[PDB]
């Protein structure tokens, strides 16, 4: 008896990349299932006995160390933000991204991006800190939305404002960062550059200034980029589905919790 599509879906939940196992081998479902459950339980037991770190938390800590060591100030800003910030980002009620916003009250929303809060920090810190101003944030962002898109994800955004805000310097920070993480990439590109892993977008990056700056009281050169942490994990651990890298009750470090 061939496996049913339902059975195949069930085994794929339990399959980790590099199991080196085939599902067209003439072994019954119940036995293939039992083998995989066994391995996945062992994977959790090993994490529990040895490291005990969540991949998303650990990646955040590794990224944080990278940027702190390179001169960037760690920011932790509100996740719940004024709706007015979305309009001031130039996102009108007719825009597709406007339909993607999770509204909370009359006046607030879950941030879909880190830029508005970072804009405010750039303007404020420019009164206190020497040139250039270098900051970053890592945290939750939200968009109503795929095997590449989550509704609840985690962004890194870094930026620099003042001197040294060139395309060359932006590409160099991106290059050092991803070679540090061990992630293969290419950069394709007032500029806008995309950092790609094959067909998967890891980042959009920007060389300012841009006209939007003035709405935020910013009038200096700047560079920046945003990376999705779940996308980075997906590539690093070779997950077939990005849900394996997300905040979840169904997966822990890419291992099914439904055992
Ligand atoms: C003061 C300015 C600061 C500054 O830093 N400016 C330049 C920042 C670049 C602008 C940039 N930060 C931006 O505007 O969101 P975008 O939709 O482009 O997404 C950026 C990345 O987030 C990830 N990502 C986005 N949506 C996702 C989803 N639904 N699921 C998973 N990952 C996702 C993915 O890795 C994507 O490439
Ligand atoms: Mg983009």
Numbering used by the authors: 188 to 332, 335 to 378, 385 to 454
Article excerpt on this structure:
For instance, a direct link between activation of gene expression through crotonylation of Lys on histone H3 has been demonstrated. Using an evolved PylRS (L274A C313A Y349F) from M. barkeri ε-N-crotonlyl-lysine was introduced into histones. All four adenylated amino acids occupy the same space in the active site of the aaRS domain. While the adenosine and phosphate moieties superimpose almost perfectly, the amino group can take up alternative conformations by rotating 180° around the C-Cα bond, as seen in the complex structures of Kalk, Kcr and Kpr. Compared to the pyrroline ring in Pyl the alkyne, butyryl, crotonyl or propionyl functional groups in Kalk, Kbu Kcr and Kpr are smaller. Thus more space and a higher degree of flexibility is possible and not all atoms of the methylene spacer carrying the functional group are fully defined in the electron density. Our data show that analogs containing only the peptide-bond motif, can efficiently bind to the active site of the wild type PylRS. Thus Kalk, Kbu, Kcr, and Kpr are recognized as substrates and fit well in the pocket. The data were processed with XDS to 2.05 Å (Kalk), 2.28 Å (Kbu), 2.15 Å (Kcr) and 2.2 Å (Kpr) spacing, respectively, ensuring consistent indexing and choosing the same set of free reflections.
